[model samples]
Target: NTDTLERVTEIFKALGDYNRIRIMELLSVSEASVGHISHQLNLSQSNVSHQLKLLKSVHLVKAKRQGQSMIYSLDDIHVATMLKQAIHHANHPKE
Candidate 1:
Protein backbone atom coordinates (compact mmCIF):
# COMPACT_ATOMS: atom_id res chain seq x y z
CA ASN A 1 0.00 0.00 0.00
CA THR A 2 2.81 2.38 0.80
CA ASP A 3 4.43 1.72 -2.55
CA THR A 4 1.15 2.40 -4.28
CA LEU A 5 0.80 5.63 -2.38
CA GLU A 6 4.23 6.71 -3.48
CA ARG A 7 3.34 6.01 -7.10
CA VAL A 8 0.21 8.10 -6.68
CA THR A 9 2.20 10.95 -5.18
CA GLU A 10 4.18 11.07 -8.41
CA ILE A 11 0.92 11.34 -10.33
CA PHE A 12 -0.18 14.27 -8.23
CA LYS A 13 3.14 15.97 -8.87
CA ALA A 14 2.83 15.48 -12.61
CA LEU A 15 -0.68 16.92 -12.45
CA GLY A 16 0.50 20.09 -10.72
CA ASP A 17 -0.15 22.29 -13.74
CA TYR A 18 -3.25 23.97 -15.12
CA ASN A 19 -2.85 22.38 -18.55
CA ARG A 20 -2.39 18.91 -17.13
CA ILE A 21 -5.26 19.43 -14.74
CA ARG A 22 -7.50 20.43 -17.62
CA ILE A 23 -6.51 17.29 -19.48
CA MET A 24 -7.32 15.13 -16.47
CA GLU A 25 -10.64 16.88 -15.97
CA LEU A 26 -11.60 16.13 -19.53
CA LEU A 27 -10.48 12.52 -19.38
CA SER A 28 -12.42 12.02 -16.17
CA VAL A 29 -15.60 12.57 -18.12
CA SER A 30 -14.69 10.78 -21.34
CA GLU A 31 -11.92 8.78 -22.90
CA ALA A 32 -10.40 11.05 -25.56
CA SER A 33 -7.83 11.07 -28.32
CA VAL A 34 -4.85 13.46 -28.34
CA GLY A 35 -6.27 15.29 -31.31
CA HIS A 36 -9.64 15.60 -29.57
CA ILE A 37 -8.10 16.99 -26.40
CA SER A 38 -5.90 19.39 -28.33
CA HIS A 39 -8.80 20.61 -30.41
CA GLN A 40 -11.02 21.07 -27.38
CA LEU A 41 -8.39 23.12 -25.58
CA ASN A 42 -7.08 24.91 -28.67
CA LEU A 43 -3.64 23.37 -28.10
CA SER A 44 -1.43 21.60 -30.57
CA GLN A 45 -1.64 17.80 -30.85
CA SER A 46 1.97 17.51 -29.70
CA ASN A 47 1.27 19.53 -26.57
CA VAL A 48 -1.66 17.37 -25.48
CA SER A 49 0.16 14.18 -26.41
CA HIS A 50 3.20 15.29 -24.40
CA GLN A 51 1.15 15.87 -21.28
CA LEU A 52 -0.58 12.53 -21.88
CA LYS A 53 2.82 10.89 -21.85
CA LEU A 54 3.62 12.37 -18.44
CA LEU A 55 0.23 11.38 -17.07
CA LYS A 56 0.68 7.86 -18.39
CA SER A 57 4.20 7.61 -16.92
CA VAL A 58 2.78 7.64 -13.38
CA HIS A 59 -0.04 5.25 -14.41
CA LEU A 60 -2.47 8.01 -13.50
CA VAL A 61 -3.92 7.59 -16.94
CA LYS A 62 -4.39 4.59 -19.17
CA ALA A 63 -4.26 4.60 -22.94
CA LYS A 64 -5.55 2.32 -25.64
CA ARG A 65 -5.16 2.34 -29.37
CA GLN A 66 -8.23 3.13 -31.44
CA GLY A 67 -7.03 2.68 -35.00
CA GLN A 68 -4.52 5.47 -35.61
CA SER A 69 -5.44 7.35 -32.45
CA MET A 70 -4.73 6.79 -28.75
CA ILE A 71 -7.49 7.29 -26.20
CA TYR A 72 -6.80 8.17 -22.56
CA SER A 73 -8.79 7.68 -19.37
CA LEU A 74 -8.17 7.92 -15.62
CA ASP A 75 -6.52 4.87 -14.10
CA ASP A 76 -7.17 5.47 -10.42
CA ILE A 77 -10.66 5.92 -9.09
CA HIS A 78 -9.18 6.31 -5.61
CA VAL A 79 -7.21 9.34 -6.74
CA ALA A 80 -10.42 10.95 -7.94
CA THR A 81 -12.04 10.18 -4.61
CA MET A 82 -9.07 11.62 -2.74
CA LEU A 83 -9.35 14.81 -4.74
CA LYS A 84 -13.07 15.04 -3.96
CA GLN A 85 -12.40 14.52 -0.26
CA ALA A 86 -9.78 17.23 -0.23
CA ILE A 87 -12.09 19.62 -2.02
CA HIS A 88 -14.90 18.89 0.43
CA HIS A 89 -12.58 19.42 3.36
CA ALA A 90 -11.44 22.73 1.93
CA ASN A 91 -14.94 23.95 1.26
CA HIS A 92 -16.75 22.54 4.27
CA PRO A 93 -14.01 22.46 6.88
CA LYS A 94 -14.71 21.03 10.35
CA GLU A 95 -18.15 21.80 11.53
Candidate 2:
Protein backbone atom coordinates (compact mmCIF):
# COMPACT_ATOMS: atom_id res chain seq x y z
CA ASN A 1 0.00 0.00 0.00
CA THR A 2 2.96 2.27 0.46
CA ASP A 3 3.62 2.36 -3.25
CA THR A 4 0.02 3.21 -3.91
CA LEU A 5 0.15 5.93 -1.29
CA GLU A 6 3.27 7.43 -2.80
CA ARG A 7 1.81 7.42 -6.28
CA VAL A 8 -1.35 9.07 -5.03
CA THR A 9 0.74 11.66 -3.25
CA GLU A 10 2.62 12.48 -6.42
CA ILE A 11 -0.63 12.89 -8.35
CA PHE A 12 -1.92 15.27 -5.73
CA LYS A 13 1.36 17.15 -5.77
CA ALA A 14 0.96 17.64 -9.49
CA LEU A 15 -2.59 18.84 -8.93
CA GLY A 16 -1.60 21.11 -6.02
CA ASP A 17 -0.76 24.12 -8.17
CA TYR A 18 -3.32 26.68 -9.31
CA ASN A 19 -1.98 27.02 -12.84
CA ARG A 20 -1.79 23.28 -13.30
CA ILE A 21 -5.31 22.93 -11.99
CA ARG A 22 -6.52 25.55 -14.42
CA ILE A 23 -4.70 23.82 -17.24
CA MET A 24 -6.34 20.55 -16.31
CA GLU A 25 -9.69 22.23 -16.03
CA LEU A 26 -9.37 23.53 -19.57
CA LEU A 27 -8.17 20.14 -20.79
CA SER A 28 -11.03 18.46 -19.01
CA VAL A 29 -13.31 20.32 -21.41
CA SER A 30 -11.33 19.74 -24.60
CA GLU A 31 -7.88 19.15 -26.00
CA ALA A 32 -5.99 22.29 -27.02
CA SER A 33 -2.64 23.45 -28.27
CA VAL A 34 -0.21 25.26 -25.99
CA GLY A 35 -0.80 28.48 -27.92
CA HIS A 36 -4.54 28.22 -27.46
CA ILE A 37 -4.23 27.37 -23.78
CA SER A 38 -1.91 30.28 -23.22
CA HIS A 39 -4.26 32.66 -24.95
CA GLN A 40 -7.33 31.43 -23.12
CA LEU A 41 -5.67 31.37 -19.72
CA ASN A 42 -3.65 34.55 -20.33
CA LEU A 43 -0.51 32.69 -19.40
CA SER A 44 2.76 32.98 -21.29
CA GLN A 45 3.34 30.25 -23.84
CA SER A 46 6.48 29.17 -22.09
CA ASN A 47 4.59 28.91 -18.82
CA VAL A 48 1.96 26.73 -20.46
CA SER A 49 4.63 24.52 -22.00
CA HIS A 50 6.42 24.18 -18.66
CA GLN A 51 3.23 23.28 -16.85
CA LEU A 52 2.36 20.77 -19.58
CA LYS A 53 5.73 19.11 -19.17
CA LEU A 54 5.09 18.59 -15.47
CA LEU A 55 1.55 17.37 -16.11
CA LYS A 56 2.87 14.94 -18.70
CA SER A 57 5.48 13.65 -16.27
CA VAL A 58 2.75 12.91 -13.76
CA HIS A 59 0.66 11.10 -16.39
CA LEU A 60 -2.19 13.52 -15.89
CA VAL A 61 -2.01 14.81 -19.45
CA LYS A 62 -0.91 13.59 -22.81
CA ALA A 63 0.01 15.26 -26.06
CA LYS A 64 -0.19 14.41 -29.73
CA ARG A 65 1.34 16.02 -32.75
CA GLN A 66 -1.14 17.81 -34.96
CA GLY A 67 0.61 19.57 -37.79
CA GLN A 68 3.00 22.08 -36.23
CA SER A 69 1.16 22.04 -32.92
CA MET A 70 0.93 19.60 -30.06
CA ILE A 71 -2.60 18.98 -28.87
CA TYR A 72 -2.90 18.22 -25.19
CA SER A 73 -5.63 16.46 -23.25
CA LEU A 74 -6.28 14.65 -19.99
CA ASP A 75 -4.53 11.30 -20.02
CA ASP A 76 -7.69 9.25 -19.59
CA ILE A 77 -11.23 8.98 -18.30
CA HIS A 78 -9.89 8.64 -14.77
CA VAL A 79 -8.25 12.03 -15.01
CA ALA A 80 -11.33 13.59 -16.54
CA THR A 81 -13.54 12.13 -13.80
CA MET A 82 -11.20 13.32 -11.09
CA LEU A 83 -11.16 16.85 -12.48
CA LYS A 84 -14.91 16.95 -12.80
CA GLN A 85 -15.48 15.68 -9.27
CA ALA A 86 -12.97 18.06 -7.78
CA ILE A 87 -14.42 21.08 -9.55
CA HIS A 88 -17.95 20.04 -8.62
CA HIS A 89 -16.93 19.64 -4.99
CA ALA A 90 -15.24 23.02 -5.01
CA ASN A 91 -18.34 24.65 -6.45
CA HIS A 92 -20.58 22.98 -3.86
CA PRO A 93 -21.67 25.19 -1.02
CA LYS A 94 -20.73 24.33 2.55
CA GLU A 95 -23.13 24.20 5.47
Candidate 3:
Protein backbone atom coordinates (compact mmCIF):
# COMPACT_ATOMS: atom_id res chain seq x y z
CA ASN A 1 0.00 0.00 0.00
CA THR A 2 3.01 2.26 0.31
CA ASP A 3 3.19 2.51 -3.45
CA THR A 4 -0.42 3.62 -3.57
CA LEU A 5 0.27 6.19 -0.87
CA GLU A 6 3.26 7.44 -2.80
CA ARG A 7 1.20 7.74 -5.92
CA VAL A 8 -1.43 9.70 -4.02
CA THR A 9 1.19 12.05 -2.65
CA GLU A 10 2.66 12.59 -6.07
CA ILE A 11 -0.74 13.40 -7.51
CA PHE A 12 -1.42 15.93 -4.79
CA LYS A 13 1.96 17.46 -5.33
CA ALA A 14 1.16 17.95 -8.99
CA LEU A 15 -2.12 19.59 -8.05
CA GLY A 16 -0.45 21.95 -5.60
CA ASP A 17 0.60 24.40 -8.28
CA TYR A 18 -2.03 27.02 -9.10
CA ASN A 19 -0.97 27.18 -12.75
CA ARG A 20 -1.24 23.42 -13.04
CA ILE A 21 -4.73 23.55 -11.58
CA ARG A 22 -5.67 26.15 -14.18
CA ILE A 23 -4.35 23.89 -16.92
CA MET A 24 -6.46 21.04 -15.63
CA GLU A 25 -9.49 23.32 -15.56
CA LEU A 26 -8.95 24.16 -19.21
CA LEU A 27 -8.50 20.51 -20.06
CA SER A 28 -11.54 19.43 -18.09
CA VAL A 29 -13.71 21.23 -20.60
CA SER A 30 -12.01 19.92 -23.73
CA GLU A 31 -8.73 18.96 -25.26
CA ALA A 32 -6.45 21.95 -25.83
CA SER A 33 -3.18 22.57 -27.61
CA VAL A 34 -0.30 23.80 -25.44
CA GLY A 35 -0.30 27.12 -27.22
CA HIS A 36 -4.02 27.66 -26.69
CA ILE A 37 -3.71 26.77 -23.04
CA SER A 38 -0.79 29.12 -22.53
CA HIS A 39 -2.55 31.95 -24.33
CA GLN A 40 -5.89 31.47 -22.61
CA LEU A 41 -4.41 31.15 -19.13
CA ASN A 42 -1.92 33.96 -19.77
CA LEU A 43 1.02 31.71 -18.95
CA SER A 44 4.22 31.25 -20.88
CA GLN A 45 4.26 28.28 -23.24
CA SER A 46 7.36 26.89 -21.57
CA ASN A 47 5.80 27.24 -18.14
CA VAL A 48 2.62 25.51 -19.28
CA SER A 49 4.63 22.73 -20.87
CA HIS A 50 6.59 22.26 -17.66
CA GLN A 51 3.46 22.03 -15.56
CA LEU A 52 1.94 19.64 -18.11
CA LYS A 53 4.96 17.39 -17.76
CA LEU A 54 4.37 17.25 -14.01
CA LEU A 55 0.69 16.55 -14.52
CA LYS A 56 1.39 13.87 -17.12
CA SER A 57 3.84 12.17 -14.78
CA VAL A 58 1.01 11.65 -12.29
CA HIS A 59 -1.39 10.48 -15.06
CA LEU A 60 -3.71 13.36 -14.24
CA VAL A 61 -3.40 14.49 -17.83
CA LYS A 62 -2.64 12.92 -21.18
CA ALA A 63 -1.49 14.21 -24.53
CA LYS A 64 -1.59 13.24 -28.17
CA ARG A 65 0.12 14.62 -31.20
CA GLN A 66 -2.07 16.23 -33.83
CA GLY A 67 0.20 17.29 -36.62
CA GLN A 68 2.51 20.00 -35.30
CA SER A 69 0.97 20.53 -31.86
CA MET A 70 0.19 18.39 -28.87
CA ILE A 71 -3.32 18.38 -27.44
CA TYR A 72 -3.84 17.69 -23.74
CA SER A 73 -6.77 16.73 -21.59
CA LEU A 74 -7.86 15.03 -18.37
CA ASP A 75 -6.93 11.37 -18.25
CA ASP A 76 -9.10 9.87 -15.56
CA ILE A 77 -12.75 9.95 -14.69
CA HIS A 78 -11.83 9.42 -11.04
CA VAL A 79 -9.81 12.62 -11.07
CA ALA A 80 -12.61 14.59 -12.69
CA THR A 81 -15.08 13.27 -10.12
CA MET A 82 -12.75 14.18 -7.30
CA LEU A 83 -12.17 17.65 -8.74
CA LYS A 84 -15.91 18.25 -9.09
CA GLN A 85 -16.55 17.20 -5.50
CA ALA A 86 -13.71 19.33 -4.21
CA ILE A 87 -15.02 22.30 -6.16
CA HIS A 88 -18.40 21.91 -4.51
CA HIS A 89 -16.89 21.65 -1.07
CA ALA A 90 -14.67 24.63 -1.70
CA ASN A 91 -17.76 26.66 -2.53
CA HIS A 92 -19.63 25.48 0.54
CA PRO A 93 -20.54 27.45 3.62
CA LYS A 94 -19.08 26.48 6.98
CA GLU A 95 -21.08 26.59 10.17
Candidate 4:
Protein backbone atom coordinates (compact mmCIF):
# COMPACT_ATOMS: atom_id res chain seq x y z
CA ASN A 1 0.00 0.00 0.00
CA THR A 2 2.87 2.31 0.75
CA ASP A 3 4.65 1.53 -2.53
CA THR A 4 2.30 3.43 -4.81
CA LEU A 5 2.26 6.69 -2.89
CA GLU A 6 1.65 8.54 -6.13
CA ARG A 7 -2.08 8.66 -5.53
CA VAL A 8 -1.46 10.21 -2.11
CA THR A 9 0.86 12.71 -3.73
CA GLU A 10 -1.58 13.34 -6.55
CA ILE A 11 -4.51 14.16 -4.25
CA PHE A 12 -2.49 16.67 -2.22
CA LYS A 13 -1.26 18.34 -5.40
CA ALA A 14 -4.78 18.46 -6.81
CA LEU A 15 -6.07 20.17 -3.66
CA GLY A 16 -3.35 22.81 -3.67
CA ASP A 17 -5.48 25.48 -5.29
CA TYR A 18 -8.27 27.69 -3.94
CA ASN A 19 -10.52 26.99 -6.92
CA ARG A 20 -10.15 23.27 -6.47
CA ILE A 21 -10.81 23.64 -2.72
CA ARG A 22 -13.98 25.63 -3.40
CA ILE A 23 -15.18 23.05 -5.89
CA MET A 24 -14.59 20.25 -3.42
CA GLU A 25 -16.42 22.14 -0.65
CA LEU A 26 -19.42 22.68 -2.89
CA LEU A 27 -19.56 19.09 -4.07
CA SER A 28 -19.32 17.96 -0.46
CA VAL A 29 -22.77 19.46 0.08
CA SER A 30 -24.57 18.00 -2.95
CA GLU A 31 -24.12 16.76 -6.46
CA ALA A 32 -24.03 19.62 -8.95
CA SER A 33 -23.71 20.23 -12.65
CA VAL A 34 -20.83 22.18 -14.19
CA GLY A 35 -23.30 24.92 -15.16
CA HIS A 36 -24.54 25.05 -11.59
CA ILE A 37 -21.10 25.25 -10.06
CA SER A 38 -19.96 27.87 -12.50
CA HIS A 39 -23.06 29.98 -12.01
CA GLN A 40 -23.03 29.58 -8.27
CA LEU A 41 -19.43 30.74 -7.98
CA ASN A 42 -19.77 33.36 -10.69
CA LEU A 43 -16.69 31.75 -12.22
CA SER A 44 -16.01 30.98 -15.82
CA GLN A 45 -17.53 27.67 -16.82
CA SER A 46 -14.34 26.84 -18.64
CA ASN A 47 -12.25 27.34 -15.51
CA VAL A 48 -14.63 25.50 -13.20
CA SER A 49 -14.86 22.60 -15.58
CA HIS A 50 -11.11 22.57 -15.93
CA GLN A 51 -10.66 22.33 -12.17
CA LEU A 52 -13.35 19.66 -12.04
CA LYS A 53 -11.39 17.64 -14.55
CA LEU A 54 -8.32 17.79 -12.32
CA LEU A 55 -10.34 16.90 -9.24
CA LYS A 56 -11.86 13.95 -11.03
CA SER A 57 -8.48 12.82 -12.29
CA VAL A 58 -7.38 12.26 -8.70
CA HIS A 59 -10.66 10.44 -7.96
CA LEU A 60 -11.49 12.99 -5.27
CA VAL A 61 -14.65 13.75 -7.18
CA LYS A 62 -17.05 11.57 -9.12
CA ALA A 63 -19.32 12.48 -12.01
CA LYS A 64 -22.48 11.05 -13.48
CA ARG A 65 -24.52 11.94 -16.52
CA GLN A 66 -27.98 13.33 -16.25
CA GLY A 67 -29.40 14.10 -19.65
CA GLN A 68 -27.13 16.74 -21.20
CA SER A 69 -25.37 17.55 -17.95
CA MET A 70 -22.80 15.80 -15.81
CA ILE A 71 -23.41 16.06 -12.07
CA TYR A 72 -20.38 16.00 -9.81
CA SER A 73 -20.01 14.86 -6.22
CA LEU A 74 -17.32 13.95 -3.70
CA ASP A 75 -16.04 10.49 -4.53
CA ASP A 76 -17.06 9.07 -1.13
CA ILE A 77 -17.68 9.67 2.56
CA HIS A 78 -13.93 9.70 3.13
CA VAL A 79 -13.66 12.76 0.95
CA ALA A 80 -16.20 14.52 3.14
CA THR A 81 -14.30 13.54 6.27
CA MET A 82 -11.07 14.82 4.84
CA LEU A 83 -12.65 18.18 4.11
CA LYS A 84 -13.94 18.41 7.67
CA GLN A 85 -10.57 17.48 9.06
CA ALA A 86 -8.89 20.16 7.01
CA ILE A 87 -11.35 22.75 8.19
CA HIS A 88 -10.93 21.77 11.79
CA HIS A 89 -7.18 21.86 11.59
CA ALA A 90 -7.19 25.24 9.94
CA ASN A 91 -9.38 26.70 12.64
CA HIS A 92 -7.66 24.98 15.53
CA PRO A 93 -5.41 26.98 17.80
CA LYS A 94 -1.74 26.26 17.39
CA GLU A 95 0.02 24.93 20.49
* lDDT, candidate 1, 31-60, per-residue tens: 655686689788888676677677677666
Estimate TM-scores for all models: 0.71, 0.73, 0.76, 0.74
CA lDDT of each candidate?
Answer: 0.71, 0.72, 0.72, 0.72
TM-score-based ranking, best first?
3, 4, 2, 1
Q: Which predicted model would earn the best TM-score? A: 3
What global local distance difference test value does model 3 have?
0.72
Q: How would you encode candidate 4's per-residue C-alpha lDDT over 1-95 as one tens digit per residue?
A: 67489767775677656776776666677665668768878888877767767667767667888788777765589758876888888866966
Local error of candidate 4 at residue 12 (angstroms): 2.1
* Counted clashes in each candidate structure: 0, 0, 0, 0
- Show where candidate 2 strays beyond 4 Å: 89-95
| True-structure Cα RMSD, model 4 | 2.9
- Which pairs clash in the backbone of model 3? none
Question: What TM value does model 1 have?
Answer: 0.71
Error of 1 at 86 (Å): 1.5
Tens-digit lDDT string for candidate 2 (6-36): 8778865776557666666666777666687
